[PDB]
Amino acid sequence: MNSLAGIDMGRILLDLSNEVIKQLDDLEVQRNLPRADLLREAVDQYLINQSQTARTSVPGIWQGCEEDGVEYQRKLREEW
Amino acid sequence: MNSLAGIDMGRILLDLSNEVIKQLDDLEVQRNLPRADLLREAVDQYLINQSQTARTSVPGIWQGCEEDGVEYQRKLREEW
Incomplete structure (x- = not known):
């Protein structure tokens, strides 16, 4: 016998x-209203x-790091 | 605190x-946490x-207008 006072309204515990x-x-006493x-x-x-604004915030940290390369140096790489 | 992490929280719909x-x-998914x-x-x-009215309130009665604060325990029974 769920008459459901509200239409299309769910409920959570x-x-x-x-x-x-x-x-x-x-708070209910002063407001005289149900919880x-x-x-x-x-x-x-x-x-x-x-949810109101997003301009204030800025994108997180993202770059991928660890980039590829020719990987052809050595020789006199040190001290140079 | 005599005890904590106990189970006795009132349920509200x-x-x-x-x-x-x-x-x-x-919000729950994006944050990846329990609702x-x-x-x-x-x-x-x-x-x-x-709670901006926090003017250091401290009634001598310590709130007693609502519910006299009575419960049947002491003896009673709750399995053992």
Whole structure:
């Protein structure tokens, strides 16, 4: 008998310590809203912060290193 | 701490929007780490940001307005 209040909306389980529940409760009291509502906003906010700009950041380290060559020297290679 | 790494974390259900599960996947995959870790930091990060009122609060009652704090243990039974 799953009426599903939300359409096309999934659900996930969250594991948090009891001490955390107390923290959320305090936030819920002041906001007078359910945790689920707070959690949803937390994620949405997280994604927004994660994805917003990329100009500030710069490409990692990439060059391949170890390049090939003629490999024909020796002789007086040293001290030269 | 008397004990840690124990199992007794409260379970909480989070409702998202399908397409959200995918968004998280990209972050979880790209970063190559457990989602639970991503969520944990998500909430914690939210709590930290929503903690600008930290004016050194410390009620004498130590929070007692909600839940008197009672549980049946001591004796009881939990297999042995």
